[PDB]
Ligand binder design. Structure first.
Ligand SMILES: Nc1ncnc2c1ncn2[C@@H]1O[C@H](COP(=O)(O)OP(=O)(O)OP(O)(O)=S)[C@@H](O)[C@H]1O
Ligand SMILES: Nc1ncnc2c1ncn2[C@@H]1O[C@H](COP(=O)(O)OP(=O)(O)OP(O)(O)=S)[C@@H](O)[C@H]1O
Ligand SMILES: Nc1ncnc2c1ncn2[C@@H]1O[C@H](COP(=O)(O)OP(=O)(O)OP(O)(O)=S)[C@@H](O)[C@H]1O
Ligand SMILES: [Mg+2]
Ligand SMILES: [Mg+2]
Ligand SMILES: [Mg+2]
Lengths: 170, 293, 315, 327, 340, 288
């Protein structure tokens, strides 16, 4: 019943259909972004459909996040070690007391807290409704504020954009 | 540069109401307002040109309102010009109003402070008590340059082509009737541009019209309207401006109206105070021709 | 008022669909196995795409068709909010279907959905693919964004052959006991141009209007297709013959100049009989005539001049 | 009263019996309604052929006095966006019948002006609600209609009205309102109508207005041409003969006199000359090519407005040069 | 009926509706866990930075029946948890759209509700149409009856024990005013009754404060402006400030203005305060602002007053807010900043 | 007065309340006004599937003058831009007068106060060829008829409006031992919800399910009518002021609602073309 492309998913970084040079470049960039005071704050990955952007990002996160994540002293939510290497934004979440355009903001204002003992890689693959002009402007303003922010610590931010054409619609 | 103001709502309620009205009016028109603190009076300005088109609001408050009024600066007349977000001051003023309503004699203290933690940008440290809980608000504000302050000027209205209209006091027997007259047109959905007209010879009469290919609204006034010491004077104005004028009229008593034919509308409000008599605080609203004849 | 035969005799099982035998057999195997993946069915209008999808869903579900199918369409709202609420809740719904079956979301005419709706569909399919499957039906496959295509198997339906149309028409006639001949059925097939719905409609109109099905009777209800007349007009040896065709068969029959120019361009695009340069010059002249018509001069003289220029180019 | 209305509306057919020139379509629709097997209809044709009149008369016949609430009519003048299709038409087509009068009809007049999204939404509405709902789509340009909508509607082509139908309708109009029309005047009216009944009625009304006393005065060809302002055939023949036989100066003088005596327009003259030349004997194709191309270019230039004398001289020179190819 | 519960008090209906509305505010889908003793409605945001829990005791409902053994449909929601005392607890957890539950639980404008029933039926004799659907029956005082069957998706429950650890640390460090001893005993009883388990690195700070002051301050706060909330505690005063950080662009241009709104009180006003020996903590404001409003909805006069308890530790560690009602327990966990 | 039709009254509140029932029928539509010696009739028709007719009696108007002896009634049409708000209205009494002088003259409404004089003119329009009287209930064959209190029906309609109802089902059933069932079943994003009225006389008074004949009453047959909630919610405002509501379903499927508050409102709405199998199955399950 399970589709093969889901059944036969990579279990390690060595099974990802990615070229050696691109993989090494991504590793170096992501490792640099994880440093205490990293010059780079956002990793913008752009490519066609099904080129293993999210796959390689998740595989690298599974190895990197445990290395830098500061050990906790019993402050974890549950008894589990909080297997949340990647925190992703869901664009179809509709909470009760919140305007739609403010959804992504509410995500970002939370994502800032996932640092040090709560370290987590922030992945943005499911973008908000950027086709709405106001939503796109708010998204751009929030990204700029993240880039120009003035906090001593921020979590690595990864934005994976699948470049594709928009067919002419009536 | 030193700024220190102390306000007490219990003492001199009329001037406190004047300040409330000015703050509410400026916050109900735009996002930011200009505050000029002078050695003699405080000016609050809401104008499109900041640091037909929309109207302008100018409020003058005498220095005698504030129990303590220390305004020191290196500029002429110790003038300090600031640009402040209307929403923040308005929220602080609601907080203070509800605190006073709960019952207290606390005084609101306003000071200007420099913010190194954050065109220099400073803060207003509005502090008041509540019986005790200390309420403090650091409202961001922008210090405005002398030349930029000089750029903003009061609009001038010709006094030969303008005729003043005296309105009945809100506290009088005709006050409720005139308030209802004013609000008559504030209940029609698609109406956006009203047409005020004044006819001389009731010595004078004021009418409100709305002309449309399908609709014809026309409201007359039959009460005694006096003219402050030729009969065709009409002006088209937006409904928001008329609503602002309606709200303003409900607070003051010596309200004056003026219509510069096909030019503009002027709404003047003054607050008499006993003592010679003290300086009379004023609120002047200028509305430009929305469409015109 | 009996229902038209286009709907009265709509196939209910996939075995009753004629043409595209390979894809229909594949769909039958899918229904038998039950492991239906995400799919996109594309093809010409009126060839059995909606019917095929509905028959597959019926065969797969059965008693659970009502609770396991969420049919959305152009007439129904299909905005981003719809994907956010209705499709999301349907996908989240937990059913108790047999072991090898999944809920089916039929997005008929999916080539008209908004870009934001498709972007949200990306995530809803990425998350709810374990129990929900999507069967997009469209005319152009490229109208679906590539991220959605990546997860869907593509089935392109071919134009119906004459044999399949004749077989289905004969079955319908036998069921309805309609009197028919050979020339009438040949004319119906020729005018169908691979669209079975059009064939059935023309047959019904002819029988109801004139009774017995004949070549003349069919021609009365249905005229010769416009593209073939246009192609004959374009492919001519003498300018006089082309002018005669344009006047008698097109202008006097009540065809607008704009329609004639558009069909001429479409025919010249797919014509393969002359060199590239000749076709290019014909397209150029057709475009100039289309320009001159769009500005208000939709006169017969413009079409005559276009034909004259095309003929000069041919020589 | 109806006397105030223009003849184009006063003489609007009230029953299908008054519809002329569409005998095959009329008979087919009669059989459909009699047998209760009316399919989705697509009336495609040029302006003023009787599509709106035919569908209105059909609706009257099917229902009668209930036409108000049995038929929903939408045209270009009304809003016909995707939202309208999704709400108003869907609600109308998804409701039961007032008196079980067969079915509910939807007349989408001038549907060729509808948006592509609206047509896409309407296709499935048409398919879903067909047991007790019917659709009629009137159009003058088919290429603006989506292929699926064309496939799902049975197409009826409204040909230009034949001469006999227009003569019958003119006779009916004359009988209804006392007036006399000469046979030559009737022939000229038919020729200038080009299969349009609206033009026929408008020209007849304006020609009655032209006559001093419309009681004993008979309409003549001269009156028709004066009212319409179009050239008479004799003028076209004379100018063509002068152009093809006389010199440049003589041809210029003849054209100027012809177009100044009655203030004729050059567009009408060019169209008449084109029609005359279309039925002549030509021994070479290049002559026809030159004539057609140059005349089409001159009409295109005239459409944008320019120097009248330049365009007239251009027509004369184009004709002379093209006819030089012969022999 | 696999699960049945009913509410017949106006104030209880108000508090239930407010709790459901808040939970729908945190997360689009609310998680409802049914046990033999309590009903837990909880939510957590996508970032995993806030967790809201509302536990209604069986006493909160006049009639409460739980028969997990009858459940057949949606068997994946049934779960079993071991107990330290050699006991097994059986629970059933599902996920329900929060907006729908809120729109079902609202009090009608003008009319009054006499009974509010929530039931889950997944027994052997369960109609297929009534499978994996939560049954809600609302009776009006005018004898009108409304029925709802919103969909629910079975899920598994992962208990959160951060509060247990914070209580353990608080008792170990700070364990005189009799009220403080009563609070200590209550915390010990809570730790013991729970079916789960229990220097300079043992930082722990506790503040019990009358909810009236904080509620009044937070009602005026606007989340659209003052995103962050900072608590400063001294030995002499407590200050709570809703604030925002200024952001500067390319040419030192304000990308987002900074505003502050602070209220300060003396430690004598506070009900209780215990510090590890100026301690400052920072976190988000929206969830706290919405959470502080659930308790007052019932408007009870007996038992204890509406007091909110706060537990916090080093920056970056979670902060825990707790409130209690005669038959309800409200808990909020948030993630704090780790700048210092 | 020197006009064909001239009415004047002081009970402006009643007229405003009655006219406020015409809001839900949209703002791009038109209102037909029938003038007659009996009184005033206000007619609105929407989508050719719903119609409302409000009657104002002569006794309500303090003074009434109908001098158009040539015709027993006058028809006129007015565009509903914001006329609902115009007739909406302190301490002093306000006199409302309506004036109309034949076709081609504006419909004039004048409010007279102690010191304020209002006058509003409405232009008339060509009467649509569509007959607003085409939708009516056949009294010979009534599937069922019911009497309900206005308050309960208004509460039920508000409840359906809150949940964003998309489709509505009117279910009526009469059984032995005085068993009466009237229910509204809403299909919406919530799924299928049911609101059933009680058998108490104070709320639900008296019921018949005739099965079509209006003479014989049978027990056991259930009448189900399927409606679009867009049309069904247009009577909520009329029901808010209602004191009694009379429901009637015929065999043809037309729903008639009589609203009594001395102002009577008659509403007719059509039933949807067909019922889906899933909806019928859910109805059967809910009613078992
Ligand atoms: N060896 C493999 N390497 C990479 N991906 C694989 C492999 N085998 C299976 N996959 C799956 O193939 C899919 C494509 O990888 P993705 O990273 O999701 O594509 P993408 O770059 O994200 O493009 P989009 O934006 O998701 S359409 C994923 O679902 C993977 O799990
Ligand atoms: N291959 C076929 N075999 C038999 N009947 C067919 C076939 N294709 C079409 N038909 C008939 O034509 C009717 C319409 O076919 P559809 O499948 O609805 O059209 P379509 O291919 O979906 O085109 P679109 O996408 O709706 S524009 C069906 O109900 C059948 O009666
Ligand atoms: N067959 C006909 N018989 C009699 N009168 C006709 C006929 N066709 C048209 N007319 C007249 O011309 C008018 C044209 O009416 P329509 O039926 O709207 O024409 P049309 O074909 O719809 O043109 P378009 O496509 O809408 S521009 C009618 O009102 C009649 O007065
Ligand atoms: Mg991916
Ligand atoms: Mg289809
Ligand atoms: Mg027409």
């Amino acid at each position: 019943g399970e589709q093969w492309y889901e059944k036969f998913k990579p279990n390690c970084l060595e099974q990802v259909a990615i070229h050696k040079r691109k993989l090494k470049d991504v590793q170096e960039a992501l490792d640099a972004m994880f440093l205490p005071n990293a010059k780079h704050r956002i990793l913008l990955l752009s490519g066609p459909s099904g080129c293993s952007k999210s796959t390689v990002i998740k595989e690298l996160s599974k190895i990197l996040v445990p290395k830098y994540r500061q050990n906790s002293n019993g402050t974890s939510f549950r008894s589990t070690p909080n297997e949340h290497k990647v925190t992703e934004f869901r664009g179809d979440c509709i909470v009760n007391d919140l305007p739609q355009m403010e959804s992504f903001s509410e995500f970002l204002k939370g994502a800032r807290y996932l640092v040090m003992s709560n370290l987590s890689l922030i992945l943005i693959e499911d973008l908000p409704n950027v086709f709405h002009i106001d939503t796109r402007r708010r998204f751009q303003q929030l990204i700029l504020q993240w880039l120009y922010s003035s906090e001593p610590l921020l979590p690595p931010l990864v934005i994976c954009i699948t470049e594709c054409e928009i067919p002419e619609n009536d | 540069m030193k700024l220190k103001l102390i306000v007490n709502g219990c003492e001199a309620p009329d001037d406190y109401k004047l300040l409330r009205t000015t703050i509410n009016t400026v916050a109900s028109l735009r996002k930011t307002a200009i505050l000029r603190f002078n050695s003699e009076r405080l000016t609050i300005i809401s104008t499109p040109k900041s640091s037909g088109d929309t109207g302008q609001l100018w409020c003058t408050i005498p220095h005698d309102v504030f129990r303590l009024y220390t305004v020191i600066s290196a500029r002429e007349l110790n003038t300090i010009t600031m640009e402040c977000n209307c929403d923040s001051l308005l929220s602080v003023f609601k907080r203070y109003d509800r605190v006073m309503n709960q019952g207290s004699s606390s005084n609101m203290t306003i000071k200007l402070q420099s913010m190194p933690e954050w065109n220099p940008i400073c803060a207003l440290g509005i502090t008041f008590e509540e019986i005790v809980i200390m309420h403090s608000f650091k409202v961001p504000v922008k210090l405005l340059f002398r030349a930029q302050d000089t750029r903003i000027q009061e609009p001038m209205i010709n006094y030969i082509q303008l005729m003043m209209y005296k309105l009945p006091p809100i506290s009088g027997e005709f006050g409720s009737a005139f308030h209802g007259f004013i609000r008559r047109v504030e209940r029609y959905s698609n109406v956006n541009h009203i047409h005020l007209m004044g006819v001389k010879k009731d010595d004078v009469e004021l009418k409100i019209i709305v002309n449309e290919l399908d609709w014809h609204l026309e409201i007359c006034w039959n009460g005694p309207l006096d003219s402050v010491i030729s009969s065709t004077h009409e002006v088209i104005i937006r409904c928001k401006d008329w609503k602002v004028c309606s709200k303003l009229y409900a607070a003051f008593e010596e309200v004056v109206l003026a219509i510069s034919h096909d030019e503009s509308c002027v709404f003047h409000c003054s607050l008499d105070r006993g003592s010679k008599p003290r300086e009379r605080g004023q609120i002047i609203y200028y509305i430009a021709r929305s469409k015109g004849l | 008022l009996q229902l038209p035969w286009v709907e009265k005799y709509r196939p209910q099982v996939l075995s009753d669909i004629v043409g595209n035998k390979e894809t229909i057999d594949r769909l039958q195997q899918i229904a038998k196995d039950g492991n239906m993946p995400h799919m996109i069915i594309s093809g010409m209008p009126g060839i059995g795409k909606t019917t095929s999808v509905h028959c597959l869903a019926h065969e797969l579900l059965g008693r659970s068709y009502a609770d396991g199918v969420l049919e959305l369409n152009a007439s129904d709202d299909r905005g981003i909010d719809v994907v956010r609420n209705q499709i999301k809740h349907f996908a989240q719904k937990k059913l108790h279907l047999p072991p090898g079956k999944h809920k089916i979301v039929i997005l008929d005419e999916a080539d008209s959905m908004t870009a934001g709706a498709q972007q949200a569909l990306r995530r809803t399919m990425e998350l709810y693919s374990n129990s929900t499957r999507f069967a997009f039906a469209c005319n152009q496959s490229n109208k679906i964004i590539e991220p959605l295509q990546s997860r869907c198997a593509i089935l392109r339906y071919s134009k119906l052959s004459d044999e399949d149309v004749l077989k289905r028409l004969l079955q319908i006639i036998k069921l309805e006991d309609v009197k028919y001949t050979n020339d009438g059925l040949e004319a119906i097939i020729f005018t169908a141009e691979g669209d079975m719905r059009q064939a059935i409609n023309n047959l019904q109109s002819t029988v109801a209007g004139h009774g017995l099905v004949n070549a003349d009777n069919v021609f009365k209800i249905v005229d010769s297709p416009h593209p073939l007349i246009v192609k004959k007009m374009l492919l001519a040896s003498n300018l006089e013959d082309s002018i005669q065709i344009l006047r008698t068969d097109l202008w006097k029959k009540g065809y607008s100049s704009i329609d004639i120019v558009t069909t001429s361009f479409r025919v010249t695009k797919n014509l393969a009989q002359v060199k590239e340069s000749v076709r290019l010059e014909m397209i150029k002249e057709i475009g100039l005539t289309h320009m001159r018509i769009l500005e208000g001069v939709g006169t017969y003289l413009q079409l005559a001049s276009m034909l004259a220029k095309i003929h000069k180019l041919n020589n | 009263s109806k006397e105030n209305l223009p003849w184009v509306e006063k003489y609007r057919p009230e029953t299908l019996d008054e519809v002329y020139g569409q005998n095959e379509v009329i008979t087919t629709v009669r059989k459909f309604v009699d047998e209760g097997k009316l399919p989705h209809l697509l009336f495609y044709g040029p302006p003023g052929t009787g599509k709106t009149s035919t569908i209105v008369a059909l609706a009257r016949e099917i229902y009668g006095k209930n036409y108000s609430n049995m038929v929903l009519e939408l045209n270009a003048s009304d809003d016909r966006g995707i939202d309208v299709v999704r709400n108003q038409i869907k609600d109308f087509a998804s409701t039961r019948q007032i008196f079980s009068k067969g079915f509910k009809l939807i007349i989408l007049d001038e549907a060729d002006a509808m948006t592509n999204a609206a047509q896409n939404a309407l296709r499935r509405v048409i398919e879903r609600y067909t047991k007790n709902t019917r659709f009629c789509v009137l159009a003058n340009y088919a290429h603006k209609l989506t292929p699926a909508l064309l496939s799902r509607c049975t197409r009826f082509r409204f040909q230009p009205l034949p001469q006999e139908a227009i003569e019958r309708r003119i006779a009916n109009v004359l009988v209804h309102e006392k007036l006399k029309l000469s046979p030559n005047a009737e022939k000229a009216l038919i020729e200038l109508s080009n299969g349009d009944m609206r033009r026929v009625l408008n020209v007849l009304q304006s020609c009655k207005a032209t006559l001093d006393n419309p009681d004993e005065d008979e309409i003549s060809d001269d009156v028709i041409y004066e009212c319409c302002g179009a050239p008479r055939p004799s003028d076209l023949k004379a100018v063509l003969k002068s152009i093809l036989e006389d010199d440049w100066g003589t041809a210029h003088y003849t054209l100027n006199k012809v177009r100044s005596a009655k203030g004729l327009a050059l567009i009408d003259l060019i169209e008449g000359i084109v029609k005359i030349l279309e039925d002549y004997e030509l021994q070479n194709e290049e002559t026809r090519v030159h004539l057609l191309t140059k005349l089409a270019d001159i009409e295109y230039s005239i459409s944008k407005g320019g120097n009248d004398q330049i365009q007239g001289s251009a027509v004369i020179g184009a004709i002379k040069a093209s006819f030089e190819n012969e022999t | 009926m696999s699960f049945k519960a009913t509410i017949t008090e106006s104030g209880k209906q108000n508090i239930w509706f407010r709790a459901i509305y808040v939970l729908s505010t945190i997360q689009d889908d609310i998680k409802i866990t049914v046990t033999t003793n309590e009903l837990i409605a909880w939510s957590m945001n996508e970032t995993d930075t806030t967790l809201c829990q509302v536990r209604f005791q069986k006493s909160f409902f006049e009639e409460y029946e739980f028969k997990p053994h009858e459940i057949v449909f949606g068997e994946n929601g049934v779960q079993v948890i071991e107990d330290t005392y050699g006991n097994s607890h059986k629970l059933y957890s599902f996920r329900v759209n929060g907006r729908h539950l809120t729109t079902i639980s609202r009090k009608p404008d003008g009319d009054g509700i006499k009974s509010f029933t929530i039931a889950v039926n997944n027994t052997s004799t369960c109609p297929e149409s009534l499978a994996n659907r939560l049954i809600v029956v609302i009776e009006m005082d005018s004898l009108i009856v409304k029925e709802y069957c919103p969909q629910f998706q079975p899920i598994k429950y992962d208990p959160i024990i951060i509060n247990l650890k914070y209580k353990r640390r608080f008792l170990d460090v700070f364990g005189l005013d009799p009220k403080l001893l009563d609070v200590f005993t209550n915390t010990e009883r809570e730790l013991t009754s729970a079916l789960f388990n229990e220097t300079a690195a043992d930082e722990i700070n506790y503040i019990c404060c009358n909810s009236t002051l904080l509620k009044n301050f937070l009602d005026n706060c606007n989340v659209n402006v003052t995103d962050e909330v900072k608590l400063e505690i001294n030995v002499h005063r407590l200050s709570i400030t809703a604030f925002t950080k200024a952001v500067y662009g390319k040419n030192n241009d304000l990308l987002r203005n900074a505003l502050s709104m602070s209220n300060t009180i003396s430690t004598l006003d506070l009900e209780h305060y215990c510090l590890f020996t100026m301690k400052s903590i920072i976190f988000k404001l929206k969830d706290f602002k919405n959470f502080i409003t659930i308790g007052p909805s019932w408007k009870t006069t007996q038992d204890g007053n509406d007091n909110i308890s706060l537990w916090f530790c080093h920056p970056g560690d979670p902060i825990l807010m707790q409130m209690q009602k005669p038959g309800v327990k409200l808990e909020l966990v948030e993630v704090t900043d780790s700048n210092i | 007065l020197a006009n064909k039709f001239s009415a004047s009254t002081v009970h402006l509140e009643h007229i405003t309340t009655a006219l406020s029932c015409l809001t839900p029928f949209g703002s791009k539509d038109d209102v037909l006004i029938f003038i007659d010696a009996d009184g005033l009739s206000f007619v609105r028709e929407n989508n050719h599937v719903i119609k409302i007719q409000l009657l104002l009696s002569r006794e309500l108007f303090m003074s009434y003058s109908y001098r158009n002896e040539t015709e027993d009634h006058m028809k006129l049409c007015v565009k509903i831009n914001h006329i609902l708000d115009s007739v909406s209205v302190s301490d002093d009494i306000v006199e409302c007068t309506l004036s109309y002088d034949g076709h081609g003259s504006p419909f004039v409404l004048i409010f007279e106060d102690s010191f304020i004089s209002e006058r509003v003119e409405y232009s008339t329009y060509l009467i649509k060829d569509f007959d607003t009287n085409g939708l009516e209930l056949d009294r010979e064959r009534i599937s069922f008829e019911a009497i309900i209190k206005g308050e309960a029906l208004h509460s039920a309609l508000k409840d359906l409006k809150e949940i964003g109802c998309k489709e509505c089902y009117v279910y009526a059933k009469t059984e032995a031992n005085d068993e009466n069932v009237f229910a509204l079943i809403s299909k919406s994003q919530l799924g299928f919800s049911k609101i059933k009225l009680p058998s108490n006389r104070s709320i639900l008074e008296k019921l018949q399910v005739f099965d079509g004949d209006s003479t014989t009453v049978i027990d056991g047959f259930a009448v189900i009518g399927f409606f679009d909630f867009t049309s069904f919610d247009k009577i909520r405002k009329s029901t808010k002021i209602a004191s009694k509501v009379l429901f009637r379903m015929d065999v043809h499927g037309v729903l008639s609602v009589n609203i009594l508050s001395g102002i009577v409102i008659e509403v007719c709405m059509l039933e949807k073309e067909s019922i889906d199998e899933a909806a019928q199955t859910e109805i059967e399950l809910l009613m078992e």
